[PDB]
Amino acid sequence: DIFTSPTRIEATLNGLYAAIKNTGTKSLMGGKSYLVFDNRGDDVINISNNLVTLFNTYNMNVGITDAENADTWTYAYLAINKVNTFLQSLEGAREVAGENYDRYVQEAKFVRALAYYYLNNLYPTPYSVNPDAKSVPLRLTAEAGTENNNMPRSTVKQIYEHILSDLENISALDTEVNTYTGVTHATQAAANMLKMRVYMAMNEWDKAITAGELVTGYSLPEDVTLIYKAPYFSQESIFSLPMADTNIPNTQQSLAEYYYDGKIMLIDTKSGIMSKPDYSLATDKRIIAFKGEKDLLMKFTDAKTKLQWVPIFRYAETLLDLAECYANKAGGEATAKSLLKQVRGRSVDAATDPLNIDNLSGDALKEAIYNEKRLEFIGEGIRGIDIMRRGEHFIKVGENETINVGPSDEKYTWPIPQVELLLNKDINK
Numbered sequence: 001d002i003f004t005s006p007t008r009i010e011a012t013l014n015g016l017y018a019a020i021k022n023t024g025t026k027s028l029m030g031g032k033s034y035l036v037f038d039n040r041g042d043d044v045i046n047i048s049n050n051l052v053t054l055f056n057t058y059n060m061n062v063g064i065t066d067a068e069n070a071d072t073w074t075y076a077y078l079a080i081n082k083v084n085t086f087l088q089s090l091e092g093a094r095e096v097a098g099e100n101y102d103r104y105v106q107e108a109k110f111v112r113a114l115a116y117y118y119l120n121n122l123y124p125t126p127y128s129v130n131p132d133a134k135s136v137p138l139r140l141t142a143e144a145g146t147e148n149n150n151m152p153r154s155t156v157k158q159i160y161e162h163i164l165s166d167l168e169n170i171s172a173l174d175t176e177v178n179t180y181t182g183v184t185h186a187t188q189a190a191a192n193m194l195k196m197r198v199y200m201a202m203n204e205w206d207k208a209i210t211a212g213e214l215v216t217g218y219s220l221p222e223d224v225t226l227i228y229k230a231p232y233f234s235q236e237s238i239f240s241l242p243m244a245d246t247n248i249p250n251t252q253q254s255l256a257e258y259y260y261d262g263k264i265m266l267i268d269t270k271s272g273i274m275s276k277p278d279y280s281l282a283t284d285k286r287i288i289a290f291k292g293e294k295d296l297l298m299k300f301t302d303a304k305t306k307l308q309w310v311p312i313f314r315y316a317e318t319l320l321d322l323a324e325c326y327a328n329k330a331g332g333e334a335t336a337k338s339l340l341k342q343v344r345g346r347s348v349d350a351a352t353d354p355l356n357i358d359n360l361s362g363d364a365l366k367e368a369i370y371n372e373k374r375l376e377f378i379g380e381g382i383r384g385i386d387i388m389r390r391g392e393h394f395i396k397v398g399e400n401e402t403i404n405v406g407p408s409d410e411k412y413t414w415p416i417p418q419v420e421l422l423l424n425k426d427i428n429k
């Protein structure tokens, strides 16, 4: 814990990655807080009728005392404070760190950047609607006391701008493809993926392209099932949260526990992506692999071991994000189409595809990219972010009720939770 050796520095660094995943009793992006982003979306449905298993998130009804709100807040800020403390301790251990000092700093900053990024996609009105919308307190000092709980919220723009600062120097980060360490520590590719996501949320299509075009060395394997079974990564995998028998999430906190038995999450086959005929083709690899009997999503179904890794960034995302950027750029349509074709062609045979990608333009092209992203990333912690960053309504047409929540509605966002309101007297200043 005192940084007297490299192995002690690295143990604490690995604790940063654990802190954004889950603890022994609660979960963040390795469990329920990743599931939050699918529940906010419109491609799966939550039929649990149980607030303990994210029903209020799905129904766009999260209040100041909901468990998922308190937990996301508490564990994100715990992870952030661990990074702040790590960075301060590392400053006093420069010689012990030796040539690896910069990598350790830049990795720790990536973890803080990721934590803030997820908070910025729950609490504020999106930047695309209002860049001055209040988001969350920007806590950047190592704090062992309650001395500094009082702090105003920074804006959605300010949070993004700080994230960009934490990602500004990445040249000491690793660059390995298809190794445990390359997928489970932040690489330059991982940092650039986050930078791309941030710039897209700000409509900075050119800066997003520059970041995402730096992601090199990955590919799209022909088998779409590789990343959900041993060794839980492939040549497509950029960054994931790994699991081990001794650190899996507790009861009803893992991904697999939400999908495996049909009692919580199902595929929305009435109105979501897999209700659309071009995105439910019987010979699509993703439909064959993942569209289960009784509408179970078959990506994460090992609830016995819970060992499946949580995929944060993979290369199909790089391509579809780049496709979206180029579709928003004057003269970019030909490139957008070629990028879309790479991803769709991996799963859907072009010779018999009802979608003629070469003839898409304007709105039809954008919609094809949005729909491909919906099918490719069903269940992967993304859908509710794409809806929100674009300032779109969350529209969920069910048999007996329709959810329709837009940016002028209070329930578009999560409110600052009671855990914070009790301690922070400046929260509304």
Ligand SMILES: [Zn+2]
Binding pocket: 095
């Ligand atoms: Zn010395």
Ligand SMILES: [Zn+2]
Binding pocket: 101, 102
């Ligand atoms: Zn240095």
Ligand SMILES: [Zn+2]
Binding pocket: 161, 162, 163, 165
């Ligand atoms: Zn900053």
Ligand SMILES: [Zn+2]
Binding pocket: 174, 175, 176
């Ligand atoms: Zn390396």
Ligand SMILES: [Zn+2]
Binding pocket: 107, 174, 185, 186
């Ligand atoms: Zn590392």
Ligand SMILES: [Zn+2]
Binding pocket: 278, 354, 355
């Ligand atoms: Zn069609």
Ligand SMILES: [Zn+2]
Binding pocket: 222, 345, 346
């Ligand atoms: Zn192919």
Ligand SMILES: [Zn+2]
Binding pocket: 401, 402
């Ligand atoms: Zn209604």
Ligand SMILES: [Zn+2]
Binding pocket: 393, 406, 407
């Ligand atoms: Zn509207």
